[PDB]
Amino acid sequence: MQEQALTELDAEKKILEQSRAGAQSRVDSYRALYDENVSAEEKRTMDL
Amino acid sequence: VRRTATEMQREHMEIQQAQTQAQLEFLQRKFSNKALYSWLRGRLASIY
């Protein structure tokens, strides 16, 4: 039963790794948004 | 995984129950059981 109690931790690690991957995808998305501050076309609107 | 570990805890508890049954069986089959000493106590009490 100790081996089962110890593969349960290898399962908890998978849960936390999916959390990590979700949060990393969010950081990747918002960094792109915040870095491309205004689109090439939002500047075109202001010039217009 | 936690469920297959709880099923193993259940089989562990079942093996414990079988072992308590084996200990009771041993205490009841063994020669120097309560019945022997009761007979000897009554018999010796009459003699005494």
Tab-separated table of N, CA and C in Angstrom, chain B:
chain	number	residue	atom	x	y	z
B	1	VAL	N	-6.394	6.754	-8.855
B	1	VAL	CA	-5.297	6.167	-8.092
B	1	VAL	C	-5.639	6.119	-6.609
B	2	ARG	N	-6.190	7.199	-6.069
B	2	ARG	CA	-6.569	7.166	-4.665
B	2	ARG	C	-7.635	6.117	-4.401
B	3	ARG	N	-8.474	5.827	-5.385
B	3	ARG	CA	-9.479	4.795	-5.187
B	3	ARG	C	-8.870	3.409	-5.229
B	4	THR	N	-7.935	3.167	-6.136
B	4	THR	CA	-7.289	1.866	-6.084
B	4	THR	C	-6.419	1.716	-4.850
B	5	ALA	N	-6.067	2.815	-4.186
B	5	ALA	CA	-5.362	2.706	-2.913
B	5	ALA	C	-6.324	2.465	-1.761
B	6	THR	N	-7.513	3.046	-1.815
B	6	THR	CA	-8.514	2.739	-0.806
B	6	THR	C	-9.055	1.323	-0.938
B	7	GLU	N	-9.140	0.784	-2.147
B	7	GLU	CA	-9.508	-0.621	-2.275
B	7	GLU	C	-8.439	-1.516	-1.671
B	8	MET	N	-7.177	-1.125	-1.789
B	8	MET	CA	-6.126	-1.897	-1.151
B	8	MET	C	-6.161	-1.752	0.359
B	9	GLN	N	-6.498	-0.573	0.869
B	9	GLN	CA	-6.738	-0.450	2.301
B	9	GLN	C	-7.873	-1.363	2.741
B	10	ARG	N	-8.886	-1.520	1.897
B	10	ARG	CA	-9.995	-2.402	2.239
B	10	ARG	C	-9.559	-3.856	2.260
B	11	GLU	N	-8.748	-4.274	1.296
B	11	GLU	CA	-8.269	-5.652	1.323
B	11	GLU	C	-7.323	-5.879	2.495
B	12	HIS	N	-6.546	-4.867	2.865
B	12	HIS	CA	-5.726	-4.957	4.065
B	12	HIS	C	-6.589	-5.151	5.303
B	13	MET	N	-7.664	-4.378	5.429
B	13	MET	CA	-8.545	-4.546	6.577
B	13	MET	C	-9.221	-5.911	6.558
B	14	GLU	N	-9.539	-6.422	5.374
B	14	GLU	CA	-10.128	-7.752	5.289
B	14	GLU	C	-9.139	-8.828	5.705
B	15	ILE	N	-7.869	-8.669	5.346
B	15	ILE	CA	-6.876	-9.639	5.778
B	15	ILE	C	-6.673	-9.537	7.282
B	16	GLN	N	-6.799	-8.339	7.848
B	16	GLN	CA	-6.753	-8.211	9.298
B	16	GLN	C	-7.923	-8.916	9.954
B	17	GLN	N	-9.102	-8.833	9.352
B	17	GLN	CA	-10.246	-9.537	9.907
B	17	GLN	C	-10.039	-11.040	9.850
B	18	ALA	N	-9.531	-11.539	8.728
B	18	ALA	CA	-9.246	-12.964	8.631
B	18	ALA	C	-8.213	-13.385	9.661
B	19	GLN	N	-7.262	-12.513	9.969
B	19	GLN	CA	-6.236	-12.874	10.938
B	19	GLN	C	-6.769	-12.852	12.362
B	20	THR	N	-7.638	-11.902	12.681
B	20	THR	CA	-8.296	-11.951	13.978
B	20	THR	C	-9.122	-13.220	14.110
B	21	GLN	N	-9.766	-13.641	13.027
B	21	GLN	CA	-10.467	-14.914	13.068
B	21	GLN	C	-9.509	-16.071	13.288
B	22	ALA	N	-8.341	-16.042	12.655
B	22	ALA	CA	-7.376	-17.112	12.867
B	22	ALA	C	-6.886	-17.142	14.304
B	23	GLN	N	-6.710	-15.979	14.922
B	23	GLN	CA	-6.280	-15.950	16.314
B	23	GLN	C	-7.362	-16.483	17.238
B	24	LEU	N	-8.618	-16.134	16.979
B	24	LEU	CA	-9.695	-16.694	17.784
B	24	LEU	C	-9.775	-18.200	17.610
B	25	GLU	N	-9.668	-18.673	16.370
B	25	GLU	CA	-9.642	-20.107	16.123
B	25	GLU	C	-8.511	-20.766	16.884
B	26	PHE	N	-7.341	-20.141	16.905
B	26	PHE	CA	-6.223	-20.725	17.626
B	26	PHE	C	-6.497	-20.777	19.118
B	27	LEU	N	-6.997	-19.688	19.692
B	27	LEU	CA	-7.310	-19.689	21.112
B	27	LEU	C	-8.392	-20.687	21.468
B	28	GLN	N	-9.236	-21.064	20.516
B	28	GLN	CA	-10.303	-21.993	20.857
B	28	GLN	C	-9.910	-23.437	20.588
B	29	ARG	N	-9.016	-23.673	19.634
B	29	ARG	CA	-8.558	-25.028	19.367
B	29	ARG	C	-7.405	-25.439	20.257
B	30	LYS	N	-6.600	-24.490	20.718
B	30	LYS	CA	-5.409	-24.820	21.474
B	30	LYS	C	-5.778	-25.625	22.707
B	31	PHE	N	-4.831	-26.438	23.165
B	31	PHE	CA	-5.167	-27.346	24.246
B	31	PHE	C	-5.500	-26.599	25.521
B	32	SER	N	-4.643	-25.677	25.930
B	32	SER	CA	-4.787	-25.014	27.219
B	32	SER	C	-5.778	-23.858	27.127
B	33	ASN	N	-6.980	-24.169	26.668
B	33	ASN	CA	-7.998	-23.158	26.474
B	33	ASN	C	-8.795	-22.979	27.754
B	34	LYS	N	-9.781	-22.090	27.712
B	34	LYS	CA	-10.566	-21.801	28.903
B	34	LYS	C	-11.279	-23.042	29.410
B	35	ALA	N	-11.686	-23.926	28.504
B	35	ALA	CA	-12.410	-25.120	28.918
B	35	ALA	C	-11.533	-26.034	29.757
B	36	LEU	N	-10.288	-26.242	29.330
B	36	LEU	CA	-9.367	-27.070	30.097
B	36	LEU	C	-9.215	-26.548	31.510
B	37	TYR	N	-8.863	-25.275	31.644
B	37	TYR	CA	-8.639	-24.715	32.962
B	37	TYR	C	-9.907	-24.674	33.784
B	38	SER	N	-11.072	-24.541	33.160
B	38	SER	CA	-12.308	-24.599	33.927
B	38	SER	C	-12.519	-25.987	34.500
B	39	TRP	N	-12.297	-27.016	33.685
B	39	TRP	CA	-12.418	-28.382	34.180
B	39	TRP	C	-11.439	-28.646	35.304
B	40	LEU	N	-10.184	-28.258	35.113
B	40	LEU	CA	-9.188	-28.498	36.142
B	40	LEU	C	-9.510	-27.719	37.404
B	41	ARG	N	-10.036	-26.505	37.270
B	41	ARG	CA	-10.365	-25.721	38.449
B	41	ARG	C	-11.505	-26.356	39.223
B	42	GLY	N	-12.559	-26.780	38.532
B	42	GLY	CA	-13.658	-27.425	39.232
B	42	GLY	C	-13.249	-28.739	39.867
B	43	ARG	N	-12.488	-29.542	39.135
B	43	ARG	CA	-12.037	-30.829	39.633
B	43	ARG	C	-11.141	-30.668	40.856
B	44	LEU	N	-10.132	-29.806	40.761
B	44	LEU	CA	-9.263	-29.557	41.898
B	44	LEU	C	-9.997	-28.878	43.036
B	45	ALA	N	-11.022	-28.081	42.752
B	45	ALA	CA	-11.757	-27.457	43.840
B	45	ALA	C	-12.536	-28.496	44.623
B	46	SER	N	-13.105	-29.482	43.933
B	46	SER	CA	-13.749	-30.582	44.643
B	46	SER	C	-12.742	-31.344	45.493
B	47	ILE	N	-11.602	-31.703	44.902
B	47	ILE	CA	-10.582	-32.430	45.654
B	47	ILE	C	-10.118	-31.622	46.856
B	48	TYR	N	-9.874	-30.334	46.664
B	48	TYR	CA	-9.389	-29.481	47.737
B	48	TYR	C	-10.408	-29.370	48.852
